[PDB]
Amino acid sequence: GWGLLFYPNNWPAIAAFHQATEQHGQLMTLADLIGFHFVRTSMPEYIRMVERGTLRTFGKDVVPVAAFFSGFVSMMVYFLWWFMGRWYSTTKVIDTI
């Protein structure tokens, strides 16, 4: 649920920026326009590492697929980091360092 609840609980804050706008005969989102307007020096467009399309995505399920994927990869990470937090809670005292 930590993964499946990420997008739904973030949608209220980012939906307003996904409204479509027309810029010089081209479709652009409000978020894309905001990023394009307020110039960042060392942040080109090509590095965005976002969903740029793919030939075996089957439409209308990109977000459900991603949310589930983060859902169970979290279980591995949750397990590892729970035990890492256990280790960081150690009271062991070593004789010499």
Partner 1 sequence: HGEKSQQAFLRMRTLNWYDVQWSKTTVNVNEEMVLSGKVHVFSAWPQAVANPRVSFLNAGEPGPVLVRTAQFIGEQFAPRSVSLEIGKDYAFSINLRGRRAGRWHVHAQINVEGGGPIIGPGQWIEIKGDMKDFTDPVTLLDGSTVDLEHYGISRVYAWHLPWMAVGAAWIFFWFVRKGIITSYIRVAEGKADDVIGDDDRRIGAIVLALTILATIVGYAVTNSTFPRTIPLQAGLQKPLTPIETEGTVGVGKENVTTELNGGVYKVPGRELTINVKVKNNTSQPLRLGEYTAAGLRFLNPDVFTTKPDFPDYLLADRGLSVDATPIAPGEAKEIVVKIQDARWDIERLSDLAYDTDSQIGGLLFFFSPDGKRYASEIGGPVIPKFVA
Ligand X SMILES: CCCCCC(=O)OC[C@H](COP(=O)(O)OCC[N+](C)(C)C)OC(=O)CCCCC
Residues of this chain that interact with partner 1 (CB under 8 A) are 5, 8-9, 11-13, 15-34, 36-42, 44-48, 50-60, 62
Rule CB under 6 A: is residue 58 a binding residue for ligand CCCCCCCCCC?
no
Q: Which does 93 bind (CB under 5 to 8 A by kind): partner 1, ligand X, ligand CCCCCCCCCC, none?
A: none
- What is the rounded distance in angstroms from the CA atom of residue 65 to the CA atom of residue 77? 18
22: part of which helix (H) or strand (E)?
strand 20-22
20: left (phi over 0), alpha (psi -120 to 50) or beta: beta
Which residue's C-beta sits nearest to ligand CCCCCCCCCC?
87
